[PDB]
Amino acid sequence: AKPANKLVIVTEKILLKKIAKIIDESGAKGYTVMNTGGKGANIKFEILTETREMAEEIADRVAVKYFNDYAGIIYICSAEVLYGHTFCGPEGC
Amino acid sequence: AKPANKLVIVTEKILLKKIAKIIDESGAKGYTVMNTGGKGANIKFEILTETREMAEEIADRVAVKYFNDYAGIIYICSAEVLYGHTFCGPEGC
Amino acid sequence: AKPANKLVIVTEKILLKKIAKIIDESGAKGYTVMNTGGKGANIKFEILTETREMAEEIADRVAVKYFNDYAGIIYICSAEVLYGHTFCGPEGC
Amino acid sequence: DFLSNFLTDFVGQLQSPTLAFLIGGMVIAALGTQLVIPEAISTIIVFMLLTKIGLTGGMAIRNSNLTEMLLPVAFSVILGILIVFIARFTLAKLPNVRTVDALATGGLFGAVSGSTMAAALTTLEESKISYEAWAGALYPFMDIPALVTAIVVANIYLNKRKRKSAAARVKIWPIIEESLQGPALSAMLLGLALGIFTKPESVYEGFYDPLFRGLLSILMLIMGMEAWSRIGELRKVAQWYVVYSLIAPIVHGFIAFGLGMIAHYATGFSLGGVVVLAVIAASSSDISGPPTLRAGIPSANPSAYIGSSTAIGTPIAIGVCIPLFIGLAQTLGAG
Amino acid sequence: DFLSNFLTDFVGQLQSPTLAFLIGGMVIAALGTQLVIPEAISTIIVFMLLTKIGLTGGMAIRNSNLTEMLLPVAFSVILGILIVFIARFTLAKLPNVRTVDALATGGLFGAVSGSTMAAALTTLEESKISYEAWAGALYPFMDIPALVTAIVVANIYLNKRKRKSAAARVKIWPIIEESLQGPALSAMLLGLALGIFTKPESVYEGFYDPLFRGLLSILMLIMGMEAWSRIGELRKVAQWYVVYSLIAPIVHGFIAFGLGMIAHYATGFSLGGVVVLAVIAASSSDISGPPTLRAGIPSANPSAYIGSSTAIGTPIAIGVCIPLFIGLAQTLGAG
Amino acid sequence: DFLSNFLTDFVGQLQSPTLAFLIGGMVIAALGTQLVIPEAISTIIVFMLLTKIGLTGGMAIRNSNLTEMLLPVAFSVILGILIVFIARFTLAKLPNVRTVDALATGGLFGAVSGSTMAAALTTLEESKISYEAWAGALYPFMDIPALVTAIVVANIYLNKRKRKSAAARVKIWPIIEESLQGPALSAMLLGLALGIFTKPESVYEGFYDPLFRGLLSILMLIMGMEAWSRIGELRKVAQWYVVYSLIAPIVHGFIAFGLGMIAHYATGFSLGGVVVLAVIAASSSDISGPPTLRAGIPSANPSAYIGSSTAIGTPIAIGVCIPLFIGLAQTLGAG
Ligand code: NA
Ligand code: NA
Ligand code: NA
Structure with a gap:
């Protein structure tokens, strides 16, 4: 029952593949994209990271490359993983 | 890398615009609506608030006006914002 | 304003009804299913539990019965319920 | 109506x-x-069915007297208001039937x-019987008073359970304008x-005419499927609702046919037109209705009115009322 | 079949x-x-294609002997069970081909x-060749044994790797009733x-007949698109799967045509009917199949059977088998 | 054009x-x-409309000289590049109109x-006027230079505000290949x-021909609805954009008709063909365009170009330009 970071990136629909590829390269395990919408239509990534340096590094890349002209907010929760083979103990945990 | 509240309102489809307008008035920055469903079809707001008094005040209004005859659960997480212009430092952060 | 666990089960589309029935039996209040997708198409349960023993017991059942051949990650957040009749004070709270 | 008809017509x-x-689909x-017929496919079937029904409504209005339509429109309205009041003096007043429940169930009926x-229109065509082509455009003159009356007689019963519980305002325009949208x-x-x-x-x-009966068959499948899902909703409320859901649509129709039949006499309105x-x-x-009533009568329990209207109201007006009121107009054809 | 035919028919x-x-779409x-053809549009294309195919299936059953159909139904079943066993004695037994993988790939084939x-039906029509109009209704008598046999011969091989690993129960009704739903x-x-x-x-x-070939062209586009996506799935499993996905549909067809051809002789079954x-x-x-096999054979790897069936199984039975078995029935037409 | 025409044609x-x-829908x-016409229904209307338009494009290309089409294709390209430059020397240069905004608004126009x-095609058919059936296939030869030129003249103005701000590379192939996909x-x-x-x-x-005008009526409803939503986007940017959105489509058309009219003379191109x-x-x-321009010109404000193109660009080329340029070709028909 190990701990991890829930990095959330809720941003513009266009970026989907461009952010999906930034995550794929970070060394992140996997991610979950949702369709969403809102004011302040949208997209939402949920990325679980082992290190916090990774959740930041991902949030740093998406905000260096895309966030001066596309909208979107990156917030981090702090969750706690009970199961998942590619993450908690490969078995049990 | 400032902290904030993740106020979640998962309630009935009908209310969408009536709750979307209660949030818009609170002084909340923005929000994110999802389509969801469940038992105990649905809707889910995710609202990030600077103060906790605001996340409560929003949760107070939606529960004074709509929650005696429409279903729905308002829970608060406690996240930590890394980026977003209209919220964390307008730049960097 | 009582505290609770946000148990998240993001797993394969097939399982929807088989996991929806494991949750229904646990003694869980309700749940919220989303449609999602991702790499590492998908599904996501959000279950709010009074005890942590329940959020685990649910996560234990879904991982004993389905997680050796279907994919999916169960992580727990730790939220804080402000309203909901079948959960916080039946009134106010 | 003739028994030798309503049986023939029915089978x-x-x-x-x-x-x-x-x-x-049942x-x-x-x-x-x-x-599952996708949600996107059933809203476009509704659009097709209803633009089609409206295109001829509007195309035959540009000949008609707007005197011929006068009496059927006013009866079209008076039924919508009356039906709500009938649910008020004949179901709301029974045990384990909250009045605010029956008033919503009357606003859907x-x-x-x-x-x-x-x-019913593609039956009249199919059965070589003719009707005013603006008869479709009666529909909104009932859909809106009934919804409104339910909302307004509801938010009155509750303003009477307020003023009574102490001794010991409803905006109508927005709801008939919401209904119109x-x-x-x-x-x-x-x-x-x-x-x-x-x-x-x-x-x-x-386009709109060739596909009307083909998309209607789907919609009719849909509507007999969503008619079976809502059946569990009826066990949760009273069991007077099941008696109303059955006999109310055969009563509501006759009161209309009777009124209707005031114009195979008065303004010439067709036998197809009163069907x-x-x-x-x-x-x-x-x-x-169910959204418009979830909103204006929120204390109403959606098992009572959504389960009555969709599980039994619809399968009876299609299965039993169409072949019964085609058969009544048909017996009025002696010799 | 005639080479001068299968070439003509093919081009x-x-x-x-x-x-x-x-x-x-490939x-x-x-x-x-x-x-992207929306998910909602491809499920209603399937509904149209399959209600249409079923409406005539059912309309020509209300004349037919239910003796004429006897032999093709029993061959329709015996192929579905056999094909699974062929994948069991001829692909499961090769290296780097987990048996529980091949048994699922046999249950899709x-x-x-x-x-x-x-x-294949709108080809036979298009090519002025005729077939029993209940021939469509053979489809479920194969779709269900094959799926069942794969599930049941799978959950047997694993009950034999259990009883062997120690020395050193499958509910069939629910799956053929799930399959039916x-x-x-x-x-x-x-x-x-x-x-x-x-x-x-x-x-x-x-409605259902006018749109059959038009919605099928879309579905055929869809099915050649989703046929290319699944091609990456084949590199991840063995490379024996690519040989099976190619030659199995030309073998499975002949065994059927041979059986089929037992009734241009026995009960009169048409040359169109055996095609x-x-x-x-x-x-x-x-x-x-892939959901019904994800569920009953879960240790099966969906690259092995979903990549075999969708990436190569379908493009070959459409591209190569239809013009080959139309051409065989056609050569049986000498003079 | 004749006033007695453009009025007749318009009403x-x-x-x-x-x-x-x-x-x-406006x-x-x-x-x-x-x-709401579902998102799934409006992407399949686009697919139908555009496979249909392309099926005859392609069917009449297999007769045509590929000399007849030479001049209209090169004019089809030169307009797409020019229009962007016109938005650059006549709107980008006005106050409160960021150039990178106008260059994107020129790439949509x-x-x-x-x-x-x-x-416009189902109008020419409807009005018994004829056009090359490959005229549809001019569309991509303009859609892509214009988008490209906007992206490339944009990422030049910004490379000139870079080299100026210091004193005190755009991959084209991928965008015209993205555009093609x-x-x-x-x-x-x-x-x-x-x-x-x-x-x-x-x-x-x-299939594709019977439904073209029927699905187009829906798409035309859709496009006059999404034309009204975007109107709030115009208040947020300059008010020069409203003048451009109005008069640019009547200017862009004449420059095309003039060029077009170089082949009721040179290579025989029809009066329908230049319409x-x-x-x-x-x-x-x-x-x-708006996605292709959100991506290559990201500093562009989508109120400026998505609000100009969709709120006023489209309702004017349908409402005013079609009956005006049908009417011009029609006056060129004296006696
Ligand atoms: Na009624
Ligand atoms: Na098969
Ligand atoms: Na243009």
């Missing part, structure tokens, strides 16, 4: 695609198919179902406006 | 909309279009593809029941 | 389903219907709208390739 119409598709649902109306009724309102002012004959005979009024009357809102 | 049928739309997908069947097969079951008992001639000739059996046989489940 | 064409459905949207083109343009590219090489006459005359070029020119990207 006949029960073999037509329209009804065959209703009870059809039994694949009862066998638990994992079949006063409100119209297009898919039942649509099922609903997708279904707007689909009609657009088809109507198109065929009065523009000339949409081209696209009607090549359309009787079937509009009997139908039970299904899609449009 | 001919490769220019028909049905096949032209399969390889068509190359826009190969050029990476961002094109035993199971039917409606869109391949549908592509699938959307596609239910769409058929409804169209069949409609045309036996009700009289859906009206809506068939005005439908041969093409039903060769087809590879695609949509219906 | 006439304003009563046709195509335009009647544009201003139709007013139900203006009355705030809760009506250079880019094509299929639904406006489609609305868009759903709409791919739908065309597939219909075109089908009718050159395969023989899709069967499914065209039985198609003029209307292709005037149209404003709407769906395809």
Whole structure:
């Protein structure tokens, strides 16, 4: 029952593949994209990271490359993983 | 890398615009609506608030006006914002 | 304003009804299913539990019965319920 | 009506695609198919069915006296208001039937179902019987008073349980304007406006008319499926609701046919035209009403009125009322 | 079959909309279009294609001997069970081919593809060749044994790797009843029941029949697109799967045509009718099977069977098997 | 053009389903219907409209000289590049109009709208005027230079505000290959390739052609609804954009008609054929462009170009340009 970071990136629909590829390269395990919408239509990534340096590094890349002209907010929760083979103990945990 | 509240309102489809307008008035920055469903079809707001008094005040209004005859659960997480212009430092952060 | 666990089960589309029935039996209040997708198409349960023993017991059942051949990650957040009749004070709270 | 008719018409119409598709989706649902007509496909079927119904509504209005339509429109309204009051003096007053529940169930039974109306128009065509082509445009003159009356007689009973509980304001315009903006009724309102002012004959005979009965069979499948799902909703409320859901649509229709029949005499209104009024009357809102009533009568329990209107209201106005009120107009044809 | 035929038929049928739309979606997908036929549009195309196929299935059953259909139904079943066993003694037994993988890949190749069947029926019509109009209703008598046999011979091989690993129960009814509730097969079951008992001639000739080939061209585009996506799935499993996916549908068809051809002799079954059996046989489940096999054989790797059936099984039974088994029945026509 | 024509044609064409459905969805949207044509239904309408337009494009290319098409293709390109430059020397240079904003608004006005083109083709048919059946296939030769030129003259103005701000590289192939993969343009590219090489006459005359005007009326409703939503976007940017959105499509068309009219003389290009070029020119990207410009010109404000192109660009090329350039070609018909 190990701990991890829930990095959330809720941003513009266009970026989907461009952010999906930034995550794929970070060394992140996997991610979950949702369709969403809102004011302040949208997209939402949920990325679980082992290190916090990774959740930041991902949030740093998406905000260096895309966030001066596309909208979107990156917030981090702090969750706690009970199961998942590619993450908690490969078995049990 | 400032902290904030993740106020979640998962309630009935009908209310969408009536709750979307209660949030818009609170002084909340923005929000994110999802389509969801469940038992105990649905809707889910995710609202990030600077103060906790605001996340409560929003949760107070939606529960004074709509929650005696429409279903729905308002829970608060406690996240930590890394980026977003209209919220964390307008730049960097 | 009582505290609770946000148990998240993001797993394969097939399982929807088989996991929806494991949750229904646990003694869980309700749940919220989303449609999602991702790499590492998908599904996501959000279950709010009074005890942590329940959020685990649910996560234990879904991982004993389905997680050796279907994919999916169960992580727990730790939220804080402000309203909901079948959960916080039946009134106010 | 003739028994020799309502039986003929029934076993006949029960073999037509329209009804065959209703009870059809009722039994694949009862066998638990994992079949689902997508939500996107059932809203465009409604759009087609209702622009089509509205395009001829509007195209035959640009000849008609607007005197011929006078009496059927006022009866179209008076039924919608009355039906709500009947649910108020004959179901709300029974045990374990909260009045605010029955008033919403009366506002769905006063409100119209297009898919039942649509099922009744392609029956009259199919059975070589004719009706005013603006008869479709009666539908909104009932759908809106009934919904309004339910909302306004509801938020009165509760203002009377307020003023009584102490001794010991309803905005109508916004709800009949919200009702007018609903997708279904707007689909009609657009088809109507198109065929009065523009000339949409081209696209009607090549698109909206060819597909009307084909998309209706799907919608009729849909509506007999969603009719079976809502059946569990009836066990949760009283069991007086099941008696109302059965006999109210046969009563609401006769009161309309009787009124209707004041114009095979007064203004010439057709025997087909009063079958359309009787079937509009009997139908039970299904899609449009339940949101408009969730909103104006929120203390109402949606098992009581959504389970009454959709599980039994619709399968009876399609299965039993169409072949019964086609059969009554048909007996009025002696020799 | 005649080489002078299978070549003619092939370059001919490769220019028909049905096949032209399969390889068509195969190359826009190969050029990476961002094109997507919505999920809602492809489930209603399946519904149309399969209610249509079922409406005539059911409409011509209400004349037929139910003796004429006896032999093709029993061959329809025996192929579905056999094909699974062939995948068991001829692919499961090769290296780097987990048996529980091949048994699922055999249960998809035993199971039917409606869109391949549908592509084969509108070819036989298009090529002025005739077939029993209940030939469509053979489809479920194969789709279900094959799926079942795969599930039951799988959960036996694993009960034999249990009892062996120690020395050193499968509920069939629920899976053939789950199979019967699938959307596609239910769409058929409804169209069949409609045309036996009700009289859906009206809506068939005005809706379900006019759109059959037009919605099939889309579905054939879809199925050649989703055929290219699954190609990456084949590199991840063995490379024996690619040899099976190619030659199994030409073998499975002949065994059917041979059996089929036991009734241009025994009960009169048409040359068109055995082309439908041969093409039903060769087809590879695609949509219906992979969920039913994800569930009953979960240790099976969906790259092995979903990549075999959808990436190569379908493009071959449409591209190569239809013009080959139309051409064989056609050579049986000397003089 | 003749005033006695452009008036006749206008009040006439304003009563046709195509335009009647544009201003139709403009007013139900203006009355705030809760009506919504599902996203899934509007992408399949685009697919139908554009495979249909492409199937005949491709079917009449397999006769044509590929000399007749030479001059209209090169004018088809030169307008797309020019229009962007016109937005650069005549709107970008005005106050409160960021150049990178106008260059994107020029790349949408250079880019094509299929639904406006489609609305113009079913007008020419409807008005018994004829055009090259490959005239549709001019559309991609403008849609892509215009988008590219906007992206490349944008990422130059910003490389000039870089090299100036210091004193005190754009990959083109990927964007014209991304443009080629868009759903709409791919739908065309597939219909075109089908009718050159395969023989899709069967499914065209039985499906893609019958539904073209019927699905276009919906798309025309959609496009006059989404034309009203974007109107709030115009208040947020300058008010020079409203003057451009109005007069640019009447200017862009004449420059095309003038060029077009170099081949009622040079290579025989029809009067119908130059109406198609003029209307292709005037149209404003709407769906395809705004993503391609969000991506290559990201500092561009989507209120400036998405609000200009969709709120006023489209309702004017349908409402005013089609009946004006049909009327000009029509006056060139003296005696
Ligand atoms: Na009614
Ligand atoms: Na098969
Ligand atoms: Na243009």
